[PDB]
Design a protein around this ligand. Structure first.
Ligand SMILES: [Zn+2]
Lengths: 568, 433, 195, 96, 193, 61
């Protein structure tokens, strides 16, 4: 283990000593764009370093090639680097062409110091042993997993390091096998970066309501994919909310009151900024629970809305303008007629932020708006770079959306979220009508060849959102076994497909013995092994390893080779 | 056998739970400590005033601590019943520790004090267990039941009260290697609130439930002068606390009078004073406006109040029946008394404690100059009454001889030629003094 | 030209803010710069006196220039103390005084509007009073003073004018209009009095 | 003067020569005696010292007074307003 | 009813005087600017009122025809307070509303929605000339010459001259309109398709 | 009108700015080899304000 939770403050003080020189800017923050949790963590760190007046550089990175190019362009004066949301699984010193000897200064005296110290922060569990153990430049902020579950891995790695007859070779083989079985494991995430930096801040003691709100947003960002982690971390955020809230409850609403509350936050889509009927119609959970893509789904939706006794016009009215009667009896109405249709899990308790008279807002709606701003905020290797430029630019739009003075941007993000949900819903219903998903014994392939708004899915987050829709829909199909799906989208301008390796997940609210065991996305090593051989001009640069760009001509041979591959 | 027999836990400048999960434990000069329920247990927050040397921290607690004490190098927490104590140094280099107090039947921890040499715990029974920084015990003692404690860098102060003996103070300097004692069980003049506790109070029943004897805080001064404050709303100072024979309990402030005379004439009650520390006329105190005496978490700015002996007479201050008008005649004498007492206190620490900030000698000289300025004003006031003997008596206490020349000029100017010769005689005597 | 047209004869609100930034105010230092009897760099400035800054003691009110206090308030390393006129009682008394005398302005400090705006923006949590009420009362005073100004405008003579007790920001915002109308009225009279 | 030296076809030859010499005169005034202060600097008061900025036009790497600035496009700095005034005037950094 | 009317009027006056998003009292400033240009009106946004207090919005939406005149009276009182130094003859202000509710189709208007608030769209096809509706009506008793005044809300419930003398009998219709002293406002009839 | 130039005052301010900038540079060079940079930032912003004042004065003249 490198940096435990209890010793994060030591790293903070070391960084402060290294680069609290206002004459220059010797600290640079690298953040993976198209990642909400990384954005929230970077906002926390930016506010914190604004407090101590430490000049910092914030660079949003989309692909690994961009990271290496920037590091090559990176000046030598910068003695402190921060990686947010990436770098914890790959050989950075090999990736960035780094040896300890070039960066080491004042080597003497059992100690070592370096002219450039890089601190990574991501929660992907395949912690690179050469990066967590066999280096001093790379500094990782462990969340208690390496120090507790990688003891055998630590011993094997140190045995290999110290050893560079027959029984000696046998033990070397055993240690290497242990290391390898530790590897070849799907990339999974156990904690949220926002919670880790919030714990660090609490250790420093510079917390406030805004930082707690940022931590709530960052944790909520992982609810859709990693709901078990969200349930694990929910009590800590709840206790922090109870602690920080002033005792002057039920106070008269002033234009300056900023209140965080814990209240029923039902698992709908943009409830407070859309009609109840549309919230149900666009909720991924409800859609998966009744398979609304069929014509029977809309009829059954009307069936519920009739069964509760709510007029359809009232349900289709905007949330703010509904009658106060329904707006004050929604909870009881859900209590009466939710278990009937199996949608009892919709009822949930979450955190709601109210800023004076500006109206309330829930964390789920805010993170949906942020993701929408990330996605659609605005010969072959040139237009792709322009797409990277636009994707990175949308990161700053999503970042500035955090400011309470830019609520107009938040409204645009909400509209974009509604439109993106509509587009993903329509694409899913069209796919499930035409049955573009071809079931195999390895993975359920699905490639979009032509159709509407296909240019929207070249954005990685849009493809992930479509994957969330389809995986949620297929999760409620008990007949359909657990199996990953693969999505591709041809970019006509570049004549390339965007293959997105996905992973199955357990249905939300379905908690079992196997549910506690996470699903591991083994598309990483399969993709890399297939690409290393049989050169097909594949572009694997995303920090999310299960996303590649493939030539249109090479798409079919690549998929055939992947079927021949049993790695995943 | 009830009420005051409940030696309920008390901390310097405490606070009741009131109507919330929240509660302030201690409000020292170096910060404050607060508690809150996370719907099942207390999470304790410690914040400091000297932002730049210490850092706020809030920590999980399942025991539900009930007492606190803060210092420059570490803070101590304690429990009322089964009173496990926990001492945590602010710096991470020194490891925090916890231990269990030896608790007996009817025993309840009253107050705890921590000193960079030893840590001492108060007891409802009256025990005086003495420990070290790290928890290893040193000695256990028993005296009259301690109910409050205070610790300077190396000196500590205690008040022993029992239903048999009354309020007796004891001030002793533990020291690095010299356990020098300065007082032991000597009585003290603080008035205890009993009439107001006879079921006639508005929302003060809850506070009296928190603190039966209504003692607010026992902070020291910037130079080590013990100070007392309670429901009587009057500070008490130990002028010559250095000499055991020279005990002097002097009233230095009267909160009700100051509040009334700064309120414009209204005898308002909703203004309550929570003192934190006194430092050379700088008495920091929250002036809460409302029915709740104890402060809140949007903590009111610690507005500073100056010292004023209760020489202000309501009959005299009612000259203008209703910016409250101040009659200058005794106000100047009040300033004279302030300068005299502050000169005594500063001189006490000048030879013993030495210089603290590099300006003590200059402020002492300025204070003496103001002392003789007030003396000259009173001399002129006496000459206004054509009381040559009164002016003669006032002239003896002048310190600066420039003020003596001014006294000569006043005598020759305030229609008192007979005073001129005697002031000149005093000046000639001073020439040889 | 060297001076832009909009800065020819009036001050921009940023200039008024900068000018007001040099007023001394009393603050509570959250640090203690008093170097004990038992290194560090002093402020040793030239636009103001460094003596108080080098001798700050934690939670001991001192007086420093306003913009240094704001710079410290960028962190939690200080705390601003509202002046005595920033209390609800004094604002109410000024409101009553204004409503009582329709022809004369209140005796507020000349920099009250800009000071209120700066403190509300950057020191919103250093007031014993509810800020939502202070903002409303400040706005009410501004409206009442505007109403008084408009009625005092109906007596724009050609010789002189007396704007007694008027604040600084209002004067700055009314300068280009009044100083130009007055010039034209003077010019007309002088042309008439050409004999 | 600190922004750009530029379509001159709209001006007569006398006006063009006047501008060319007037730039020289302005520079001479800036470097004559009042060189410690920047006479061409911003006329807005320096309300704040440290600000955040975003790179509009990528300029690669530019050496500042003490360290160096890597003006990566779509990247945000948080540095002193004093040493970035000229770059913002030229049109490289946008945020305030 | 007078107590409830005063309660609602005071609540709306507080809403006007206090509502603000960020350091700017939007409605106060808008009212002041409208008074400055002799525009005795105010455009009130619905989401603002809803966010201020849902109870006020519910009471408004229940019986708008009775709530709105009280709001106009409160607006007039606020205008007098913050546009004229105390110690008149200011016309009652006209309220203007802006909302984002779902636009009900024109043919969907039915037996319900009566006396409610409705948002819809259309195309104007006819604009009649401006007629005059009285707001202040000076009136004269016919026989005993007892002159009084009447204030008309112009919000028809679902008003006529009083049917008694009100201080000899003077007849059941003892009142005549005093045209030269009454006050009138313009009203236009539009036809939507 | 153009008011008379205060030659002595401007000379004293120019000398003060020269020596202050030299002192700031010396402090920075010494620091370039505690971490209480607050006074250094104060000198920087104070010198900036003074320079802005003199710049505005000269350009108005
Ligand atoms: Zn009649």
């Amino acid at each position: 283990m490198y940096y435990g939770i209890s010793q994060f403050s030591e790293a903070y003080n070391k960084i402060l000593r290294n680069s609290s020189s206002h004459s220059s800017c010797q600290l640079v923050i690298f953040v993976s764009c198209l990642n909400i949790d990384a954005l929230c963590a970077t906002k926390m760190l930016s506010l914190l370093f604004k407090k101590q007046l430490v000049q910092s550089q914030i660079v949003p990175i989309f692909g690994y090639s961009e990271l290496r190019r920037h590091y090559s362009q990176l000046d030598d004066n910068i003695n402190s680097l921060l990686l947010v949301g990436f770098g914890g699984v790959i050989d950075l010193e090999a990736f960035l062409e780094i040896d300890p000897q070039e960066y080491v200064i004042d080597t003497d005296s059992g100690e070592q110091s370096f002219r450039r110290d890089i601190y990574v922060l991501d929660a992907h569990r395949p912690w690179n042993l050469d990066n967590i153990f066999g280096s001093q430049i790379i500094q990782c902020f462990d969340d208690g997993t390496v120090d507790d579950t990688l003891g055998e891995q630590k011993e094997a790695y140190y045995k290999l390091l110290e050893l560079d007859r027959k029984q000696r070779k046998k033990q070397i083989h055993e240690y290497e096998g242990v290391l390898e079985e530790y590897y070849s494991q799907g990339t999974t995430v156990v904690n949220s970066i926002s919670a880790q930096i919030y714990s660090l801040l609490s250790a420093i003691g510079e917390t406030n309501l805004s930082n707690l709100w940022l931590n709530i947003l960052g944790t909520t960002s992982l609810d859709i994919a990693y709901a078990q982690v969200y349930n694990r971390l929910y009590p800590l955020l709840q206790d922090e909310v109870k602690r920080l809230t002033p005792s002057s409850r039920n106070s008269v609403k002033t234009p300056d009151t900023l209140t965080l509350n814990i209240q029923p936050d039902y698992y709908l889509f943009l409830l407070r900024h859309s009609s109840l009927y549309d919230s149900f119609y666009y909720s991924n959970y409800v859609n998966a629970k009744l398979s609304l893509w069929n014509e029977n789904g809309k009829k059954r939706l009307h069936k519920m809305f009739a069964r509760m006794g709510i007029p359809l016009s009232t349900a289709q009215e905007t949330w703010l303008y509904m009658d106060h009667s329904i707006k004050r009896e929604l909870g009881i109405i859900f209590d009466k007629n939710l278990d009937r249709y199996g949608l009892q899990d919709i009822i949930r308790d979450g955190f709601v932020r109210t800023l004076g008279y500006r109206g309330s807002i829930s964390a789920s709606e805010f993170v949906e708006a942020l993701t929408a701003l990330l996605e659609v905020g605005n010969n072959s290797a040139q237009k792709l770079t322009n797409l990277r430029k636009r994707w990175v630019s949308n990161f700053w739009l999503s970042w500035d959306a955090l400011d309470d003075r830019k609520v107009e941007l938040l409204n645009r993000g909400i509209q974009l979220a509604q439109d993106l949900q509509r587009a993903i819903f329509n694409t899913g219903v069209a796919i499930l009508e035409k049955k573009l998903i071809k079931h195999l014994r390895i993975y359920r392939l699905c490639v979009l060849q032509d159709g509407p708004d296909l240019d929207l899915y070249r954005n990685p987050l849009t493809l992930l959102r479509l994957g969330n829709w389809l995986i949620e829909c297929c999760a409620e199909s008990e007949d359909k076994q657990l199996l990953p799906m693969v999505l591709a989208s041809i970019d006509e301008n570049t004549d390339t497909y965007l293959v997105a390796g996905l992973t199955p997940r357990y249905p939300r609210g379905l908690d079992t013995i196997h549910t506690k065991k996470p699903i591991l996305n083994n598309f990483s090593m399969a993709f890399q092994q297939i690409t290393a051989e049989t050169d097909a001009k594949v572009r694997i640069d995303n920090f999310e390893s299960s996303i590649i760009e493939i030539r249109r001509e090479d798409l079919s041979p690549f998929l055939e080779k992947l079927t021949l591959s049993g790695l995943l | 056998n009830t009420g005051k027999f409940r030696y309920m836990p008390f901390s310097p400048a405490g606070t009741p739970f009131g109507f919330t999960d929240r509660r302030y434990l201690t409000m020292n000069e170096v910060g404050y400590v607060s508690t809150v329920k996370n719907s099942e247990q207390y999470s304790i927050t410690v914040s400091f005033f000297d932002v730049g040397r210490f850092r706020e921290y809030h920590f999980e607690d399942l025991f539900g601590y009930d007492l606190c004490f803060l210092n420059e190098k570490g803070t101590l927490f304690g429990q009322s019943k089964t009173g496990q104590i926990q001492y945590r140094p602010h710096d991470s280099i020194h490891s925090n520790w916890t231990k269990i107090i030896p608790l007996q039947a009817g025993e309840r921890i009253t107050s705890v004090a921590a000193t960079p040499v030893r840590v001492i715990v108060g007891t409802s029974l009256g025990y005086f267990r003495s420990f070290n920084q790290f928890g290893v015990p040193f000695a256990v003692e028993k005296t009259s039941p301690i109910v409050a404690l205070t610790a300077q860098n190396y000196r500590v102060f205690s008040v022993h009260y029992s239903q048999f003996h009354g309020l007796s103070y004891s001030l002793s300097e533990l020291g690095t290697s010299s356990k020098r004692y300065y007082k032991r069980e000597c009585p003290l003049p603080m008035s205890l609130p009993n009439i107001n506790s006879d079921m006639k109070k508005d929302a003060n029943l809850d506070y009296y439930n928190f603190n039966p004897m209504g003692i607010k805080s026992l902070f020291f001064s910037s130079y080590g002068d013990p100070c007392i404050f309670g429901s009587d709303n009057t500070l008490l100072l130990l002028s010559k606390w250095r000499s055991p024979e020279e005990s002097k309990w002097l009233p230095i402030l009267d909160s009700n009078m100051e509040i009334w005379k700064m309120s414009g004439g209204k005898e308002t009650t909703d203004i309550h004073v929570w003192p934190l520390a006194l430092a050379y006329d700088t008495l920091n105190c929250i002036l809460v406006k409302g029915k709740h005496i104890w402060p809140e978490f949007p903590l009111p700015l610690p507005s500073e109040m100056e010292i004023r002996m209760p020489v202000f007479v309501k009959s005299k201050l009612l000259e203008e029946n209703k910016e409250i008008q101040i009659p200058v005649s005794m106000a100047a004498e009040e300033e004279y008394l302030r300068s005299k007492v502050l000169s005594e206190l500063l001189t006490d620490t000048l030879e013993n404690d030495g210089e603290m900030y590099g300006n003590e000698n200059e402020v002492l000289a300025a204070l003496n100059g103001a002392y003789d300025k007030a003396l000259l004003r009173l001399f002129a006031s006496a000459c206004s009454d054509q009381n040559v003997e009164k002016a003669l008596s006032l002239a003896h206490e002048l310190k600066q001889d420039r003020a003596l020349t001014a006294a000569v000029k006043i005598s020759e100017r305030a229609e008192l030629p007979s005073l001129v010769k005697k002031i000149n005689n005093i000046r000639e005597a001073r020439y040889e003094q | 030209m060297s001076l832009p047209a909009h800065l020819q004869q009036t001050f921009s609100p940023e200039e008024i803010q900068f000018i007001v930034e040099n007023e001394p105010i009393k603050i509570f230092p959250r640090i203690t710069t008093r170097q004990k009897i038992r290194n560090h760099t002093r402020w040793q400035l030239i636009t103001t006196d460094d003596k108080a800054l080098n001798n700050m003691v934690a939670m001991r009110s001192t007086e420093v220039v306003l913009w240094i206090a704001l710079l410290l308030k960028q962190q939690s390393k200080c705390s601003i103390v509202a002046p005595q006129w920033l209390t609800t009682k004094e604002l109410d008394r000024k409101i009553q005084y204004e409503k009582t005398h329709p022809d004369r302005f209140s005796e507020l400090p000349w920099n009250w509007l800009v000071l209120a705006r700066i403190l509300f923006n950057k020191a919103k949590d250093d007031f014993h009073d509810p800020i939502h009420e202070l903002r409303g009362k400040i706005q009410d005073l501004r409206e009442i003073r505007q109403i008084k100004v408009l009625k005092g405008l109906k007596y724009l003579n050609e010789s002189h004018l007396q704007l007694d007790n008027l604040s600084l920001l209002e004067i700055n915002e009314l300068r280009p209009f009044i100083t130009e109308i007055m010039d034209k009225l003077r010019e007309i009279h002088t042309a008439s009095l050409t004999a | 003067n600190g922004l750009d030296l530029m379509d001159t076809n709209n001006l007569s030859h006398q006006e063009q020569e006047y501008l060319k010499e007037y730039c020289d005169l302005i520079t001479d005034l800036k470097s004559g005696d009042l060189v410690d202060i920047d006479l061409s600097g911003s006329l807005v008061p320096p309300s704040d010292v440290f600000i955040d900025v975003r790179v509009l036009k990528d300029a690669g790497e530019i050496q500042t007074e003490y360290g160096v600035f890597n003006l990566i496009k779509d990247s945000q700095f948080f540095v002193r307003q004093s040493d970035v005034e000229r770059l913002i005037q030229q049109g490289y950094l946008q945020k305030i | 009813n007078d107590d409830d009317n005063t309660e609602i009027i005071k609540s709306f006056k507080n809403f006007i005087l206090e509502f603000r998003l960020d350091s700017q009292f939007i409605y106060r400033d808008q009212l002041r600017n409208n008074i400055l240009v002799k525009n005795y009106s105010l455009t009130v946004n619905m989401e603002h009122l809803i966010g201020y207090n849902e109870d006020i919005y519910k009471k408004l939406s229940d019986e708008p025809s009775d709530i709105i005149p009280l709001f106009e009276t409160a607006i007039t009182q606020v205008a007098k307070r913050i546009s004229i130094l105390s110690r008149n003859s200011l016309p009652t202000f006209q309220l203007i509303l802006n909302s984002n509710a779902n636009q009900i189709p024109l043919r969907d208007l039915d037996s319900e929605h009566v006396s409610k608030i409705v948002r819809l769209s259309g195309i104007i096809i006819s604009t009649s000339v401006l007629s005059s509706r009285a707001t202040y009506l000076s009136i004269m008793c016919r026989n005993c010459r007892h002159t009084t005044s009447i204030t008309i809300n112009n919000f028809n419930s679902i008003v006529s001259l009083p049917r008694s003398c009100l201080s000899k009998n003077c007849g059941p219709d003892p009142y005549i309109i005093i045209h030269e002293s009454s006050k009138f406002i313009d009203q236009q009839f539009l036809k939507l398709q | 009108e153009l008011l008379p130039y205060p030659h002595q005052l401007m000379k004293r301010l120019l000398n003060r700015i020269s020596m202050q900038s030299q002192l700031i540079e010396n402090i920075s060079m010494g620091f370039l080899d505690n971490e209480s940079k607050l006074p250094l930032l104060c000198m920087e912003t104070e010198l900036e304000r003074l320079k802005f004042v003199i710049r505005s004065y000269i350009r108005c003249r």
